[PDB]
Amino acid sequence: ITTTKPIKAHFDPVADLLTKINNARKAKLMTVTTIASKLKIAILEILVKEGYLANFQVLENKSKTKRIVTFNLKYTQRRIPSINGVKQISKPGLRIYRPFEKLPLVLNGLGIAIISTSDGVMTDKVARLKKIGGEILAYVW
Template identity: 40%
Template sequence: MALSDSIGDFLTRIRNAQLAMQRTTKVLFSKVNSSILEILRDEGYILDYQKEVVDNIPSFIVTLKYHEKSPVISDIVRVSKPGCRCYSKYKNITKAYNGLGIFIISTSKGVMTDYNAHKLKVGGEVLCRVF
């Protein structure tokens, strides 16, 4: 069965694994998922991730992060969906949760946070919101 929204599936796997208090979860491999995982690791939302290949099917093993037995990611939501894409100019990008969270944006210069997109003055598709 083919997925119509691989990013939505990726975010749902992370959300469900944290609700179940799992230490790791397995997500599908893609370049966009790799970029999002790198941002989540750099921003401190996850501990680490590793690429794994089983039966010629690549995937990522994500090590989730907890603080005092509660997940660090309290909210991870897909903003731009396949049926309704959400694009934004850099001037119109707002702060997620008054600066406590981040938006992850796919721009012409790669996938980056809202802060970096505003600094580089590039807009793009708002992929997800993390808090």
């Protein structure tokens, strides 16, 4: 509430999110701020249901003109993040599209891939169970 600091979104949502999360992970920071989008929302909750980040609350002004969102990252007392590596395959002008029969498994299943086939974000294993392939957002491991 009342962040009293101007913020501006970089560019395409997936990259705008990944750059911030990686910089925060390296800088040992706690939270970062960015404008909110439905795809960014979906990826945020699909991540947190995997337990890879702490509190994330979408925030708006005293109106529905601007909506922003912040998030904290899953840490430990020894101060080590739960994220190890992040890389996006989808890219503006370089969209990837993957049939289920050739779906890749991140780091022998240890990593997480985001595949928004037709119903939004979903885990790679639950998509294999669905045997539904499609567009791939990014690698998280």
